[PDB]
Design a protein around this ligand. Structure first.
Ligand code: B1O
Lengths: 10, 265
């Protein structure tokens, strides 16, 4: 998901 | 330790300042007219909305009026989701949660946080936009054709009551954190670790309010009710959203918002 990607980005 | 709860309070505030470009402190200064900065451009009708097209800068590049305003709110919400995600990741314990639970907390949390923070930018007369470059009057937003003229009134109504509590940015940082760490969001897999984090955040909030608002014993209990209230505001919003998606010939909804709205009430 897009939210997951935002969460994973340092 | 109480000392540790103050350190947590301070950590959240510092993170909050980092994560969110326009704070309540600065927003209130702008709204009251104390800042040395140049005045926001006032949008009070269609003609001034057109003139504002040149003056107001938006971070996102985009090479009828009611629709454009709605799309503008959309894009601001997209920016806000990203700011709020950054802030959530600064809450101790959050990044160590099951990743799908992190997603769930954000999915159900972000709009409640958006409207909490939107209040900071609102008075009874209107709302600050684009980091304070603009001010749109509450009356003009209300004058928009249906269903759009009612898009934001529920939020102004919430903000007027919420702002009467006179929280500051230090209060708000902890309030937001508590909301994000809600153990009762639909579909959470591992509830206890979220409850344990929120329990400590709630202790931090209670002590913050006791020290920062000594004369208002009722504030903590009222804020707990505002958290419940915010869920209703988001519910109403989602419902007016479905009205719009239909009562209008289909417009484009941002994919980040589509993802959030899927299964959202
Ligand atoms: C020149 C100009 C100025 C403004 C403009 O339309 C916009 C552009 C950004 C905006 N930001 C806000 C703040 O209110 C919000 C923000 C986020 C969510 C919600 C909500 O209710 O969900 C409301 N409003 C009203 C905006 C707005 F109306 C356009 C398109 N052009």
């Amino acid at each position: 998901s897009l939210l997951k990607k935002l969460l994973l980005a340092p | 330790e109480s000392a540790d709860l103050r350190a947590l309070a301070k950590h959240l505030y510092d993170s909050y300042i980092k994560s969110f470009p326009l704070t309540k402190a600065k927003a209130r200064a702008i709204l009251t007219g104390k800042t040395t900065d140049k005045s926001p451009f006032v949008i009070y009708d269609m003609n001034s909305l057109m003139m504002g097209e040149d003056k107001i800068k938006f971070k996102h590049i985009t090479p009828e009026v009611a629709i454009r305003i709605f799309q503008g709110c959309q894009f601001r919400s997209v920016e806000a989701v990203q700011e709020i995600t950054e802030y959530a990741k600064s809450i101790p314990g959050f990044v160590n949660l099951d990743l799908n639970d992190q997603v769930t907390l954000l999915k159900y949390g972000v709009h409640e946080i958006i409207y909490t923070m939107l209040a900071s930018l609102m008075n009874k007369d209107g709302v600050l936009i684009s980091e304070g470059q603009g001010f749109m009057t509450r009356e003009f937003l209300k004058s928009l054709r249906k269903p759009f003229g009612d898009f934001m009134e529920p939020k102004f109504e919430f903000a007027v009551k919420f702002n009467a509590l006179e929280l500051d940015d230090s209060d708000l940082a902890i309030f937001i954190a508590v909301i994000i760490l809600s153990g009762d969001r639909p579909g959470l897999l591992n509830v206890k670790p979220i409850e344990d984090i929120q329990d400590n955040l709630l202790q931090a909030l209670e002590l913050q309010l006791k020290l920062n608002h000594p004369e208002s014993s009722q504030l903590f209990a009222k804020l707990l009710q505002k958290m419940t209230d915010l869920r209703q505001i988001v519910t109403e919003h989602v419902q007016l959203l479905q009205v719009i998606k239909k009562t209008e010939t289909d417009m484009s909804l941002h994919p980040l918002l589509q993802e959030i709205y899927k299964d959202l009430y």
